[PDB]
Design a protein around this ligand. Structure first.
Ligand SMILES: CC(=O)Nc1cc(-c2sc(C3CCN(C4CC4)CC3)nc2-c2cccc(NS(=O)(=O)c3cc(F)ccc3F)c2F)ccn1
Length: 250
């Protein structure tokens, strides 16, 4: 089994909270995600092992690698350590001058991981650029599927059956929007309640006039399909992947 016994992991620097993520040492570098629980009930332990079971179904280069789990001294999930920062950081904080070639590659890699998860019947539920780690600045690692409102599909935003393969697709659409515009959607409306109301009712959607000159018109159309307010009108990942790989040639 994939349990790591007590004392094998050396916990280092805290990364962020929400439980808590640390850098650790275990046969090299790992990320250690501490759930806020020291004496699990024989009921929490079962929802934990249940979630571990989900993570263990993934083996793919664009999905954060599951490496094991801890019961003692604390419930914790152990993964590979990623170097660098999230796609969100690159796109919106540091303004990494990515050529359109790289931008497309990132989308393609994101599409690969999502298509993979969907094949294994896993709905992400929280895809956003903060959750796409750009390991060594090259490889997309999709994490955080074991504050999100800009990526929420109208049906999800309707305060709510809403989490589906198609809500993931919509969130992926917002990610394409981020990539192809360099911007977060609704940037000229800094109002959470307003966005919840307007996106929820279908009166507001991302401003597509903002996708850059360089964006293969074929990508812009694909992004529009992913963002269909009408959930059934959205493409599936197999189709999204096929599409992105083909335009990636030209
Ligand atoms: C430099 C660095 O931060 N490296 C790093 C970080 C992680 C992180 S970061 C991070 C958060 C921190 C809080 N915020 C904002 C402050 C930034 C959002 C992202 N989470 C991870 C992380 C660590 C372990 C598991 C997950 N996700 S998970 O759904 O539990 C998961 C576990 C698993 F075993 C396999 C896949 C998987 F998605 C993480 F997302 C994972 C691997 N490497």
């Amino acid at each position: 089994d994939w349990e790591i016994p007590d004392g094998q992991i050396t916990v280092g620097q805290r990364i962020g909270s929400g439980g808590t993520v640390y850098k650790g040492k275990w046969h090299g570098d790992v990320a250690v995600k501490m759930l806020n629980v020291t004496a699990p009930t024989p009921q929490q332990l079962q929802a934990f092992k249940n979630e571990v079971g989900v993570l263990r179904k993934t083996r793919h280069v664009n999905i954060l690698l599951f490496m094991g789990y801890s019961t003692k001294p604390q419930l914790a999930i152990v993964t590979q350590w990623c170097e660098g920062s999230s796609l969100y950081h690159h796109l919106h904080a540091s303004e990494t001058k990515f050529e359109m070639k790289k931008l497309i590659d990132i989308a393609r890699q994101t599409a690969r991981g999502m298509d993979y998860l969907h094949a294994k019947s896993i709905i992400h539920r929280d895809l956003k650029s903060n959750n796409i780690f750009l390991h060594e600045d090259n490889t997309v690692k999709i994490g955080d599927f074991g504050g999100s409102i800009l990526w929420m599909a109208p049906e999800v935003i309707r305060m709510q059956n809403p989490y589906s393969f198609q809500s993931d697709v919509y969130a992926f659409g917002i990610v394409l929007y981020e990539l192809m515009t360099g911007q977060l959607p609704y940037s000229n409306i800094n109002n959470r309640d307003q966005i919840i109301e307007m996106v929820g009712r279908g009166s507001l959607s991302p401003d597509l006039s903002k996708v850059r000159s360089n964006c293969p018109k074929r990508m812009k159309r694909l992004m529009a399909e992913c963002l269909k307010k009408k959930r059934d009108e959205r493409p599936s990942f197999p189709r999204i992947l096929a599409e992105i790989e083909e335009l990636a040639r030209e």
